[PDB]
Design a protein around this ligand. Structure first.
Ligand SMILES: O=C[C@H](O)[C@H](O)COP(=O)(O)O
Ligand SMILES: O=C[C@H](O)[C@H](O)COP(=O)(O)O
Lengths: 556, 556
């Protein structure tokens, strides 16, 4: 594998092995009054600042230098440039990787197969803008001549989680706009309980599918269409209530949606990077196209920062490099995303997909099997709730867990003269301080003495009260969570994932395990029909099928 | 540490060293046609069956024997009995651990300090039942004399996650119940967006807090009261709209709530084991007291299973042991919970707390630091969505991830003559089969041949399309997700967590690891007030505060 053969990597690993045990966050801060100043990036976007404070990490000057050298040696800059210029860097599928084109506000040419993609990107955006105005204004009427009150996105994975996470995060920008619903699971519960709350007269369905063949999405869409036509009784009416977002015109038409009711995107838009495209229509409908444009613009700002900034002060590069340090040198399996923001409640889940589906890989560009770790398990929940759920383990367990803490300085709801947000901010700050500093036995001993504990009780309790600390974090703080800033933040992590992928020499942009998934259920579906015993498979699969057949009729 | 000095553990470790490299799931099944039969438990509860299929695990007869022996030689049977008898096994806080008393439907006496706890458990349940009758009938009137339409639980962590997860899971059972809302984050967004949708005349607030001092909860509660008083004006009208669930009568009265409107619980009820107590009030209000009793009865059934069953066929014990095997022998940091059920969408998050806050520990009963792993990072999202996202990494990444796949045989919504559920089931079955089997080069090559790939294109793409498999799973299948069955499932994992805690020699029932964060936040809170620079901390904390002070009055 390319990474482990790399001399800069070997140097880094050897340094870690010899020196890492001597790195203590508490001592790093004591020894260097300028630590924050030298290990943070204050980015001015001209529409808010984003401070990336990486000073609470197990790094020093030489470590960062070695990490930056590794990024150079692994050709991060050239690979980045190739992505941006429309090179077919998704080599297993022979595709360009051009989510950056979707938000290319500068409109500079980006060519695929000799042709600039910008005119088609902008044409679709213009179409989205027109449609949103017609729907949000109440001009667009349902089959009984009523304005639309509910938008329902039907899609899964990349055709679901982006629009869901972003509409949740930008909820305060949705005043006046129609309600938005997300149906994704094949589990009939999802569509059933959604439809139960809706009228066919005032619901507009958005069928979101790159391929337009995904089993969950097409089945859900057919169920919705059946429900709709049971009420409307007019195939002509489907045009008023169904829109497709896809690359597959033939399958859209096959389903029963006319191409004029289709907004297209392209093969170089990966699902987990698709919210910027036509797939973002439910966002634009919910918050307005203006705010959707601001979202695109923030991503564009961050794209430019990524493209033009020297590696040593490049925000997504530094986040990627810190990740490499913890993954390939320390061996940390996971990375936690902990936004101190209720609107961001699905942010961690979004990048759980974006990161893991991208970098959960084991074959390189050369076809080699990796002999090192690739992508981490990404997880998290919003603060402060996590403090009362799993922070016990972060503080006092046996796992090293790099954490990104994120918060906006300004809240969307400054209730009680800002009291709630002051408390929220205090916790955000305290938790990373606590993770860094810990509490020494002698410090814990003094507290227990002042608590009036007898010598016997104190000695039994003491070790349980000790916090070993030295637990590293990033703190990412931004002026306010506006559409623009959110766009910038999502793009930042997209580029983090890119840099890690290039360094590991893997393809961040295919998903053969997801493709495998879509082939699997067809072989079992037919066996579930009828009362016949299944002996076809391994005994577990067989035994589970037998249990299912036995139990499906019993009346509880 | 007790575990590492245990000779049965050393034997297990050495077996793993010698034999685990050649342990292959495919081969285990091919060699043993009785595998499913001898590595699964079909539990008949008399109210549905629960099948715990652990056959797709990297274990054989000898491994399971060694694991059972380890449980025995670590004192699991005696420790369990001590829990059930009211022994003060929460040794750092000197408390009993008696969530099993809460759901003790048999009413067998359980003594703490010589007194049976059951009379008081039952008195509170009777009062809970009375509250439910009054609210659900419409007999409970708000300050203008109108029936309650909305219930709002205010609480965090143990006082939030349980009621939230269970009301979500049992949503079909909520016909005729009030709408239920959960406010938990201190983030003002949470209460603000909730209160915007409510009328003070028809809203009942439930302040859920064991201590009745938690900052987030008491602050949210006071904000709710302030909002109410703006409308109702009369401080005596508060008494019709506020109910408390707590152990602290004194603090409840101080807040202004009459004991008439209080439901009590006890110190031996851990927050993360509290949904079975008064804390479950919002569940019982939403789905009715009879369904809440069924939930308790299901847990009770599982309690009896755990108490009476020989270890080698004891469901929570076997789940615990498989976890010990993967954590302490294979070194797997994480454990994924993957319910193929939309109603169970908060199940993984619930046990993220239940597991991680219990077993994220590093000090043993002796006071020694563990020199082995304890609790795993728990995570997951419902199927089938995960198949389109992080399953990419489960299938093709560099991490070993034990997964529990869960599904009901019967769906709550058998739409399209069961079509959706058939597809869901087929995916559930096919994914664990594929995780075990993978896809061989000879299988992948035929697909590339059929696609018309050139010998050279085929050769380059081939390794990307091969799946190594050998990824172990549990399949947990149950007749239907009824209140009873849900109760049994939750209790099962509660007892799994208990067993692992005993084996690690840790206290599953305290949570000292949250203290430091709370201490440091109280110091920072007042520092945020005013324009003056803060220098009392490390430079990162100081610098973040400076950025917050600079950015909070920036107008975007
Ligand atoms: O990579 C995940 C995909 O986004 C998901 O399978 C949906 O695919 P689709 O957009 O083609 O329906
Ligand atoms: O373990 C977490 C606790 O349940 C949480 O902090 C809430 O505590 P409380 O019920 O005392 O408010």
């Amino acid at each position: 594998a390319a990474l482990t053969r790399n001399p800069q990597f070997q140097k880094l690993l050897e340094w870690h092995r010899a020196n890492s045990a001597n790195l203590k966050l508490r001592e790093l801060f004591e020894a260097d009054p300028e630590r924050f100043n030298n290990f943070s990036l204050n980015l001015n976007t001209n529409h808010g600042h984003i401070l990336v404070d990486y000073s609470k990490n197990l790094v020093n000057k030489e470590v960062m230098q070695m990490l930056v050298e590794l990024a150079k040696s692994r050709g991060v800059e050239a690979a980045r440039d190739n992505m941006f210029s429309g090179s077919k860097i998704n080599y297993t599928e022979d595709r360009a990787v051009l989510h950056v084109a979707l938000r290319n506000r500068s409109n500079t040419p980006i060519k695929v197969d000799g042709k600039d993609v910008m005119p088609e990107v902008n044409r679709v955006l213009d179409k989205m803008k027109s449609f949103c105005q017609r729907v949000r204004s109440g001009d667009w009427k349902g089959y009984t001549g009523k304005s639309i009150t509910d938008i329902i996105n039907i899609g899964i994975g990349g055709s679901d989680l982006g629009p869901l996470m972003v509409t949740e995060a930008l909820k305060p920008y949705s005043k006046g706009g129609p309600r938005v619903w997300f149906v994704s699971n094949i589990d009939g519960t999802h569509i059933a309980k959604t439809l139960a709350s809706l009228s066919p007269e005032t619901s507009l369905f958005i069928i979101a599918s790159k391929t337009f063949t995904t089993q969950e999405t097409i089945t859900n869409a057919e169920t919705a269409k059946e429900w709709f036509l049971e009420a409307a009784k007019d195939p002509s009416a489907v045009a008023k209530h169904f829109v497709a977002l896809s690359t597959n015109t033939a399958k859209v038409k096959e389903f029963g949606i006319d191409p004029q009711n289709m907004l297209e995107f392209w093969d170089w838009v990966g699902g987990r990077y698709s919210l910027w495209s036509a797939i973002g229509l439910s966002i634009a409908l919910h918050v307005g196209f203006d705010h959707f444009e601001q979202l695109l613009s923030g991503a564009h700002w961050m794209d430019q920062h990524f493209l033009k900034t020297p590696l040593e002060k490049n925000a997504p590069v530094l986040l990627a490099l810190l990740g490499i340090w913890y993954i390939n040198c320390y061996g940390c399996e996971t990375h936690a995303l902990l936004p101190y923001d209720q609107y961001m409640h699905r942010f961690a889940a979004y990048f759980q997909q974006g990161d893991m589906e991208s970098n959960g890989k084991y074959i390189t560009k050369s076809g080699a099997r990796v002999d090192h770790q690739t992508g981490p398990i990404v997880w998290g929940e919003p603060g402060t709730n996590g403090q009362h759920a799993f922070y016990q383990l972060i503080h006092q367990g046996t796992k090293m867990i790099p954490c990104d803490f994120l918060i906006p300085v300004q809240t969307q709801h400054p209730i009680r003269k800002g009291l709630h947000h002051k408390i929220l901010l205090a916790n955000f700050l305290a938790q990373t301080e606590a993770l860094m500093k810990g509490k020494l036995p002698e410090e814990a001993r003094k507290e227990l003495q002042a608590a009036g504990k007898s010598p016997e009780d104190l000695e039994k309790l003491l070790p349980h009260k000790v916090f070993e600390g030295n637990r590293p974090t990033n703190s990412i703080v931004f002026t306010k969570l506006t559409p623009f800033i959110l766009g910038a933040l999502i793009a930042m992590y997209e580029h983090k994932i890119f840099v890690q992928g290039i360094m590991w020499d893997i393809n961040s942009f295919d998903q053969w395990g997801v493709e495998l998934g879509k082939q699997l259920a067809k072989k079992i579906e037919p066996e579930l029909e009828g009362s016949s015993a299944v002996t076809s498979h391994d005994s577990s699969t067989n035994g589970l099928i037998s249990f299912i057949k036995q139990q499906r009729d019993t009346k509880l």
